[PDB]
Paper text:
SUFU is an essential intracellular negative regulator of mammalian Hedgehog signalling and acts by binding and modulating the activity of GLI transcription factors. Hedgehog signalling plays a fundamental role in the control of metazoan development, cell proliferation and differentiation, as highlighted by the fact that its deregulation is associated with the development of many human tumours. Here, the crystal and small-angle X-ray scattering structures of full-length human SUFU and its complex with the key SYGHL motif conserved in all GLIs are reported. It is demonstrated that GLI binding is associated with major conformational changes in SUFU, including an intrinsically disordered loop that is also crucial for pathway activation.
Here, we have expressed an essentially full-length human SUFU construct in E. coli by fusing it to an N-terminal maltose-binding protein (MBP) molecule via a three-alanine linker. The N-terminal domain exhibits the same structure as previously determined, despite the presence of the N-terminal MBP fusion partner. Although the crystallized protein was intact, both SUFU molecules in the orthorhombic asymmetric unit show no apparent density for the C-terminal domain residues 279–360, suggesting that this region of the molecule is highly mobile. Collectively, these data suggest that residues 279–360 constitute an intrinsically disordered region (IDR) that is an inherent feature of native human SUFU. We show that in the unbound form SUFU adopts an open conformation in which the IDR hovers over the surface of SUFU that interacts with the N-terminal domain of GLI proteins. Alternatively, it is possible that the IDR has a role in determining intra­cellular localization or that the SUFU IDR may act as an inhibitory module with regard to SUFU–GLI binding, as suggested by the observation that in the structure of SUFU alone the IDR appears to shield the GLI-binding surface of the protein. We propose that the IDR acts as a gatekeeper, which in the rearranged conformation becomes a target for HH-dependent regulatory factors facilitating the release of GLI from SUFU.
Residue numbers in the entry: 5 to 618, 701 to 789, 795 to 818
Write the structure that this text describes.
């Protein structure tokens, strides 16, 4: 046996297609499920990896070339007698690198739908509409309303003056030659932004807002595909479907899309899928059942096409399809669509000028490394297609100071069941290789790290009454990114960073940072390398010191067990006023134990100290070490945490040039022999302590405020005193 699961976008006929699925189950006994998940075009390549996905997937052909290259689609194998049933150009739309990768279903193209009662003669040009809108606003109506959230609906205007996505030149598509940035495209988008300034259209208008407006008669026009006609029938609005308005004398060029059905390559039911598609859905009866639910446009099945051809609504669809351009199916299409999805929104909402919104989409459409990261982000935040975002306006590769080209700011609602608070999630762009053209980072192929190999992320606890994420952390990430770039020393999970300043420039006690693998962002494959995601975690100086004395990983584990200091997701709360050792005093024990068993990472310190006798190599037999109180409290960590693990530890002087290097029995390099344990080169003193003597010395050192204290022995002496160093 086997099941058959189908995905089809919500605006299409999923109920008519379900009827066809019923007839299949009747005649065959195989159950056909139909689902219309949100953002199915993005979710497919996500869950086709785990094969948790549909046996069949429906969408415009432009997406498929991208699926096919990722090996997510099985090649379809119709015989000649079936191929003759559909038009040759619709098989063209589903052909990628020589193979048929999906069955074509229907041809879609945007048309101008107008309310005959409100507007008997629809305007032949775009420029007519501002005028036409004043007349309609007088009697309380509007002239035009259509989806401005999706570039698919505003692209006909942008392309009217000849703006394009990729150029069909010399037999192929030129992937770097994108045309969203030329005069024609700016002329089209400038005109769209104008309409919104003069309040003929509103930037907030999405699909369901426009559809409701037109179907209640509140607006005289709209732009939409054959699928929308069904609901205008139910509204009983007296409407007609016609050619789109011209712009500057040239026609609107809508991207024509062929609704196609592909078969999952991980489907165990490729044969059942071939039967359902070839001998049920693709016939006069099957296509009819889907057309009745929501019109398909001009179907690819020659027979049922000639039957509907009379329908003037179809005639107007193909008239606009002729003036438009058929969408390419190359993998780079999704990139292009996203680049423009943003450009149009930013340019319309006022976030950005038309001239720079399109100049942005130009570099970002071409740019593979950027795309991949956005793809993960969109995997985490499906319902935030346009996040507040900081952009470096003077790019880092034109001499600019700030190396992060972008920093995106998402809203993470957290988890109420697992005690993870609502917070802001920042992701950076530019530490990895975004463009792969040797502009910022050396191109090192698909094998190895992409640029530095990671991007920063940050999770900031949401303060109360905060409508939007603050922007100060984007500044911080610019600071860290500069730190990495200039030094060329990369970071790993567990590393620490001394910042010595409250991260937000308020008095916050959080003044440092540990780094750790972001708990949600998953490493990505890029055509320029691999990109993992490091997350910054704010910490107090007390905690930064623990991480230096013990380890980064160990302290990170602790921040996870104290919810108000990070929790499982290590969220930074900038209003935290207590260290984790003051919240849970019994944690200090865990660290000390962690040091006794793992050992200290601290190889030395710059502190107030000196030594005295009681270039050459002076061999001595009586030594008097002098420390500050602060650096004297270190001595037990030096003994227990390093000399016992067979490691050296060095105190540098900083008031001079003296130094004291404690050396265990049996470490290479070092000139105290233990025939004569106290040798000096210099101001450079090395003193070797046997395990026996270290263990007893630790008993004798118990750190109260008495000074100067002094400890003595048969070997040696050790003072801790106060001002002498600074004087
Ligand atoms: O807007 C970007 C989007 O455009 C196209 O999506 C269309 C789709 O082709 C239509 O059948 C209908 O469902 O409207 C969609 C836009 O809301 C592209 O096919 C798609 O890849 C792209 O992301």
């Amino acid at each position: 046996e086997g099941k058959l699961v189908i995905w089809i976008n919500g605006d299409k006929g999923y109920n008519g297609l379900a009827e066809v699925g019923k007839k299949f189950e009747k005649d065959t006994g195989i159950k056909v499920t139909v689902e219309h998940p949100d953002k199915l075009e993005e979710k497919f390549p996500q869950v086709a990896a785990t094969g948790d996905g549909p046996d069949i997937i429906f969408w415009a052909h432009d997406r498929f070339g991208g699926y096919a290259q990722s090996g997510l689609l099985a090649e379809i194998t119709p015989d000649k007698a079936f191929q003759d049933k559909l038009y040759p150009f619709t098989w063209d739309a589903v052909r990628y690198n020589g193979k048929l990768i999906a069955y074509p279903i229907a041809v879609e193209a945007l048309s101008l739908i107008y309310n005959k009662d409100l507007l008997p003669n629809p305007p032949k040009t775009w420029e007519e509409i501002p005028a036409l809108d004043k007349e309609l606003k007088a009697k309380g109506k509007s002239a035009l309303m259509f989806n401005l959230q999706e570039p698919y609906f505003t692209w006909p205007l942008i392309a009217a003056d000849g703006g394009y996505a990729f150029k069909y030149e010399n037999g192929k598509y030129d992937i770097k030659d994108v045309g969203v940035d030329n005069a024609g495209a700016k002329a089209g988008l400038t005109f769209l932004v104008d309409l919104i300034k003069n309040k003929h259209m509103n930037a907030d208008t999405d699909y369901s807002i426009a559809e409701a407006a037109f179907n209640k008669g509140e607006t005289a026009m709209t732009i939409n595909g054959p699928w929308a006609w069904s609901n205008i029938d139910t509204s009983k609005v007296n409407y007609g479907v016609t050619v789109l308005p011209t712009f500057k004398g040239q026609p609107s060029k809508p991207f024509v899309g062929v609704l196609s059905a592909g078969i999952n390559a991980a489907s165990p039911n490729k044969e059942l899928a071939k039967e359902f598609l070839e001998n049920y859905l693709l016939t006069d009866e099957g296509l009819e059942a889907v057309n009745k639910d929501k019109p398909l446009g001009a179907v690819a099945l020659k027979s049922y096409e000639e039957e509907l051809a009379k329908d003037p609504r179809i005639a107007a669809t193909m008239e606009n399809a002729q003036k438009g351009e058929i969408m390419p199916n190359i993998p780079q299409m999704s990139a292009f669509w996203y680049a423009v999805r943003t450009a149009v929104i930013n340019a319309a909402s006022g976030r950005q000028t038309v001239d720079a919104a399109l100049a942005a989409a130009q570099t970002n459409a071409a740019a593979p490394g950027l795309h991949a990261i956005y793809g993960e982000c969109r995997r985490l935040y499906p319902d935030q297609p346009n996040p507040l975002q900081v952009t470096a306006i003077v790019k880092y590769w034109l001499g600019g100071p700030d190396p992060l080209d972008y920093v995106s700011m998402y809203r993470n609602v957290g988890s109420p069941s697992a005690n993870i608070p609502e917070h802001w999630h920042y992701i950076s762009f530019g530490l990895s290789d975004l463009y792969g053209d040797n502009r910022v980072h050396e191109f090192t192929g698909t094998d190895g790290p992409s640029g530095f190999g990671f991007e920063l992320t940050f999770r900031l606890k949401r303060e109360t009454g905060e409508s939007a994420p603050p922007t100060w952390p984007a500044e911080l990430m610019q600071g860290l990114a500069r730190y990495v770039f200039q030094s060329e020393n990369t970071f790993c999970s567990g590393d620490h960073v001394s910042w010595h300043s409250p991260l937000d420039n308020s008095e916050s006690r959080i003044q440092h940072m540990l780094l750790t693998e972001d708990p949600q962002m998953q490493p990505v494959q890029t055509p320029f390398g691999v990109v993992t995601f490091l997350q910054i975690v704010g910490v107090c100086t007390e905690e930064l010191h623990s991480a230096q004395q013990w380890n980064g990983q160990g302290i990170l584990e602790l921040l996870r067990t104290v919810p108000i200091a990070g929790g499982p997701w290590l969220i930074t709360d900038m209003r935290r006023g207590e260290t984790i050792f003051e919240i849970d005093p019994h944690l200090q024990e865990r660290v000390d134990k962690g040091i006794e068993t793992d050992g200290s990472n601290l190889s030395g310190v710059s502190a107030k100290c000196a030594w005295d006798d009681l270039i050459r190599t002076r061999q001595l037999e009586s030594v008097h070490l002098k420390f500050n109180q602060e650096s004297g409290a270190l001595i037990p960590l030096c003994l227990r945490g390093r000399l016992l693990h067979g490691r050296h530890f060095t105190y540098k002087s900083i008031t001079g040039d003296m130094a004291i290097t404690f050396v265990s029995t049996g470490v290479e390099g070092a000139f105290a022999t233990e025939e004569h344990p106290y040798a000096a080169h210099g101001p450079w003193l090395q003193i070797l302590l046997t395990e026996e003597f270290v263990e007893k010395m630790l008993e004798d050192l118990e750190d109260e405020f008495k000074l100067p204290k002094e400890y003595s022995w048969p070997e040696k002496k050790l003072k801790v005193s106060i001002l002498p160093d600074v004087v």
